[PDB]
Amino acid sequence: DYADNDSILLKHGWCEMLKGGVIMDVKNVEQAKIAEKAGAIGVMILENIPSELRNTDGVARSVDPLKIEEIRKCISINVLAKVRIGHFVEAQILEELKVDMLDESEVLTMADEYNHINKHKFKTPFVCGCTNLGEALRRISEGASMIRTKGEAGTGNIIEAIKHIRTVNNEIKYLCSLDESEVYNFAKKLRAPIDLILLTRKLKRLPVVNFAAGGIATPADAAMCMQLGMDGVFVGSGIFESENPQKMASSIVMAVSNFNNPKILLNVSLGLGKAMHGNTAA
Amino acid sequence: DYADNDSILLKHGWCEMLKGGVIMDVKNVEQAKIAEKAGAIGVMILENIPSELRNTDGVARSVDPLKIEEIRKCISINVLAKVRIGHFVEAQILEELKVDMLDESEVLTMADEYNHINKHKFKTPFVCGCTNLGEALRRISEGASMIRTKGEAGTGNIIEAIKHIRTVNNEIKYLCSLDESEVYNFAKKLRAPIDLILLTRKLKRLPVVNFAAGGIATPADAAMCMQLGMDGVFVGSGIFESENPQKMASSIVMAVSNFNNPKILLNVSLGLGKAMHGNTAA
Amino acid sequence: DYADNDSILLKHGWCEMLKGGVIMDVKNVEQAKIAEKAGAIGVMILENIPSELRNTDGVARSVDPLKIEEIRKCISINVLAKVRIGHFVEAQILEELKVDMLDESEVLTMADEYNHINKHKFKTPFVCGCTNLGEALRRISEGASMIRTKGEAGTGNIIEAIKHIRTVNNEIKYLCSLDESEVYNFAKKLRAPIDLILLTRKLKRLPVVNFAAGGIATPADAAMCMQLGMDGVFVGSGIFESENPQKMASSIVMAVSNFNNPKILLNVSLGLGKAMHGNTAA
Amino acid sequence: EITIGVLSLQGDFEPHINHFIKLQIPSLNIIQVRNVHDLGLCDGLVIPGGESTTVRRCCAYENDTLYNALVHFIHVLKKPIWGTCAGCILLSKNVENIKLYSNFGNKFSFGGLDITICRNFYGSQNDSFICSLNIISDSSAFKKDLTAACIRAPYIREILSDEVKVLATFSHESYGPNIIAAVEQNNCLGTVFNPELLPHTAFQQYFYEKVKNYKYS
Amino acid sequence: EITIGVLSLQGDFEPHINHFIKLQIPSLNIIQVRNVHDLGLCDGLVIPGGESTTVRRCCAYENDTLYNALVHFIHVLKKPIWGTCAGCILLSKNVENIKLYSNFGNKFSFGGLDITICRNFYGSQNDSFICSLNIISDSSAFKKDLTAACIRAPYIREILSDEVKVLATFSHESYGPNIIAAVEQNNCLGTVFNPELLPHTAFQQYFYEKVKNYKYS
Amino acid sequence: EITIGVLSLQGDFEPHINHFIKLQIPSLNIIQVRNVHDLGLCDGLVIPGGESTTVRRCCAYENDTLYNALVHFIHVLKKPIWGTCAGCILLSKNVENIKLYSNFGNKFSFGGLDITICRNFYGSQNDSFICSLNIISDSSAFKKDLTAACIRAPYIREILSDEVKVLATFSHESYGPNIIAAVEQNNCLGTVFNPELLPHTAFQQYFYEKVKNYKYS
């Protein structure tokens, strides 16, 4: 059980494996297989809902463990699951199930409006969402081993993701500039711990693996996030709501692995089919 | 030079000596002598201004070192001085002068409206002011070795001091109650470092010496602060603007040393003379 | 006449001479002599007014050239004068008088509320005031060869000066961090020219000599500005309204020349006398 | 000038890269390898840890262009290659064994180590351990009882040739005694652990020396 | 039942108190002493470190009531007393020497140690050091090269009687050799260092044993 | 290792410093000189351009400590010194001449160049010009018709010794022909122009070679 011995140095070590990867959101075994086939380093398991249910506002909870077990035994890549913010019992349950990583996710319905899960209490590493550096550092403070941008989940619109990436990127390079005296007031402004601010300063980057997430819909979108210094990418609807999920899934992986090579980016974008329709309603 | 080796453990050690004591604000040698005579563990040296200058709004700076040297060689108790908030060069100068403690004070004119002095960079211990726990912990984070309430300087009115004492007292006992999960969000609310919050939790009190200051005008006032759990007291105008500074100075010391003994408190309050006129204009 | 051949490279060259210097504001020959004696690299000539006139709100204009000529022939250090903002004819007049540098000053009464002087049209170099990077770059764009902070003129309070120094310092190091794409929107935000922003980026600092000004009242104040990366210092009332102008003038120069040596800063602060009374009325 | 490449289309390299830079060897350059051009600049190559059903896929682009180049690099040019975690699996003759994951699988391995290997047989990812090991070499690197980062690692079930030298083994109290941790076969080095996750740089130094010798050939 | 009091009218005691509680001795009770009533319950007394021109003043109330009770305690009753930093100064015959600070000064000291002492002769408060010491006793407490907390401490300049036993010395590379750290004279123990600031409890134990012996008398 | 110092108590140095760094000479270290300790590390010293009634004052602290050290450095140790604009004035025998500015003036100059010099005789600061010069040396540095930054410069009115070598002159159409721009006398070099304000590094290179030779002595 719990971290902050060097099982941490251990968790961090494990997360580094994910650098350069694409994690994909899957609703069933067929989708998992497509993801494995495309070169995904991992899948993130989602609740399987029909479109008619989608209209309603149902409470979105962590998935039935049996459905996770069912999908995991038909693939050999990494398996991740979601829990509700502040829902430490959902986490306890999935810890016992030996899942590879947990996402304390804002896409599910909040369980506790003030407190996030105390993530040090788990051996399973957590990923958390952020839109800015303070938020990111508070999640790491709480025990997150990995961070992602929030972006705008399910819209197929990259714009929020980009903003969040640039916001964190700037604050980090700026923080790195300030003098030793100035760092204190800045810590208070970000409402973040001075220790982790000093560590970000010494590392010249975010102290944990950092993925883009939310709104990625084309290979171009994916590569753009990588060119802006991200360690990797979560993709969901952009694949499985496209015209050709399999081809789209594969091209996104290729693009992430070759994000600096325009000729490959072009090549894997040819005859891709229609991307996810999406929604531009903020 | 700088702390956070165990010269710290050293600074803290040095400050503990002050527990139970009264530090007194002095403008000249005569005042220093009265203070020494009365049992003061230390004097804090102030700029010597006439009443006519008091009307104006002159910039209040750290005192001329020569005036400090002049007073220090006529007494053997501790000698403290004030610097402007964020004025690290005034601090560097008094460090070289071998003063016993510095007060980064809000009673002087601010030199830097965003940043306080980085106090770790000095071997001289600092005292700083606060009105609440977050503020207190941010000062300690910056390297303060001792804390005082701000109170309401120069008014002879105890009310603000009392409020600040209670505010800190509560937040501390409360913090000590919360569960391990809840401490994080609370840290963010106080805009304070989680490390020092956990340390306050483990010590069951403020992690450094903590004195009352501002508005103390009678022995009664002094004892009250002590009965509320303070480690000691700064007094200024309440003594030297009273009818009988010497007698008042001595009675305040006696009260602080005997703050739980009503019979002594009575005895040292008899025939005291008029207390400082004061001002009830918030 | 006019610049932007390489008489510029010439003006810049001339201003570099001032680095490490103190320029002092003088009202008469006696004051000029004191300034020369103290080690000042230059004096800035001010209108000679009595205290009674000071109450009133008289229009403050450039000084009578004859008064400049009178002071200049009794000293051999640099001689500077002030003109009203946008008053290009006052500048034309002093250009013909062969003054060493002009200060287009906000301390004099504005002559044009929209436009500053087009300073390229002169062979005499200009200094201008700023409180932030955009403002600084717009002045340089207009032809300023040197920049100073505005601070708070005549108050003896360093606080505003410090703020302005830090504001410019940050924006500069930050600008230096951004990616090539982001620089454009930032230029628009500072309302400053992209060319000079890119040049600030390439130089890693302000593209011209940069002095602190306004509110400097002790050696400590002066050194503090230098420790924050300024090239030098303007001083006025802090000297000539102090108890001992000559000694204060000399100590300020020593401090600026030795701003990193606490032992000298201490030494030149001993027995200095009373600093300027000042005013804390924002 | 010695150039070692680290395959970077995915996996954990900026460590591996970092861990080679930790050697502080003046003559050594490290580069990322993501295409055949990069590969051509390499004196030796590291194929790091990460997914394999991922690493292999990455090499599959443009009709197996990189795959083919790697096979040629390993088997024709005989340049030194170090396959760690996933890379160890991709150097193996037998891979154990692709129930569904099979796609072009037979060509799946680059080859180079005549061994049979078992995709992480250890539970999941919240069981991965650590280790101390033993070494059957005279190389100066290998010193006192070293450490490893055996994390959800693969299992070497069979040695299939006398050419294969068992370089390092360890004994665990839950996996048996004499578990094979490191093998070497000609111009190929294979490790089942994560060398980049412990502070020491022994295996990085060893591989460097291998690449250095390869040249002087 | 042994009761040791710690004078608490100001100085650092809840340490001294804590440090006696660390002894974990079942028989031992520690109390604060602030008045003559408290003092009457004590088998032995500690006079801790802090200001002295403060501790003495605190004793001065109600026409030197506590001061007088303390002098009687030390000199008539001959009860064991331990003066540390400021307390050490207050047990000394000669105090060096009260240029301005003189008020009722001749009565300033409680007396008990026939020594001449110098109010903190070491610079200020940002120089105070630490030490290791030597000991001329057979007591079980005192063991291997111990440590101290000599913080802005006083200096024992003269020993004025053969009755005074030099209990502990130390050698510094800035104050000379054989600096007197601890003295004992009858029912009085005096130390210039801060015993409460280091983890070990040797001097606390020693003083406990003294108080214990004092009763069995 | 050659260390050249640049007097930095005020004037324009981070240029001079920059301009020596532009030489890109591996053996060369540049330091700021603000005190006698710094001066003691120097193989040669540059006294830059700026005010003099300033530079001299800066050297006047602690009863002319630095001044005296500089005089000793120039005249006893005979170490190479390069006085440019203000520094050229401060190396001069005669300085022309301190009507009011006189304070301790006779001691004002460090000495080293037996010349009479005139504090900027050219109008003010909005007339300072530029130049091309001539050179009477065989040193490799000095090449084609070089350039200068004669800015509100001083005027060398008299050469007072045959020991003084006129190193460089120029002809202006408003100051006459054969204006003395550069002089050298033993271990002293003096220039009236600003070498740091043009892109070329000829005089920096020349002074470097002087310092280099001084050592091999």
Curated annotation (Swiss-Prot), chains D, E, F:
PROSITE patterns: PDXT_SNO_1, PDXT_SNO_2. This is Pyridoxal 5'-phosphate synthase subunit PDX2. One of its GO terms (molecular function) is pyridoxal 5'-phosphate synthase (glutamine hydrolysing) activity. It comes from Plasmodium falciparum (isolate 3D7). Pathway: Cofactor biosynthesis; pyridoxal 5'-phosphate biosynthesis. L-glutamine binds at G50, E51, S52, R119, I151, R152. The keyword Lyase applies. Catalyzes the hydrolysis of glutamine to glutamate and ammonia as part of the biosynthesis of pyridoxal 5'-phosphate. The resulting ammonia molecule is channeled to the active site of Pdx1. The gene is PDX2. Disulfide bonds: none annotated. The active site is at C85 (nucleophile), N194 (charge relay system), E196 (charge relay system). GO terms for cellular component: cytosol; glutaminase complex. It catalyses: aldehydo-D-ribose 5-phosphate + D-glyceraldehyde 3-phosphate + L-glutamine = pyridoxal 5'-phosphate + L-glutamate + phosphate + 3 H2O + H(+); L-glutamine + H2O = L-glutamate + NH4(+). Changing R152W: No glutaminase activity. It is found in: Cytoplasm.
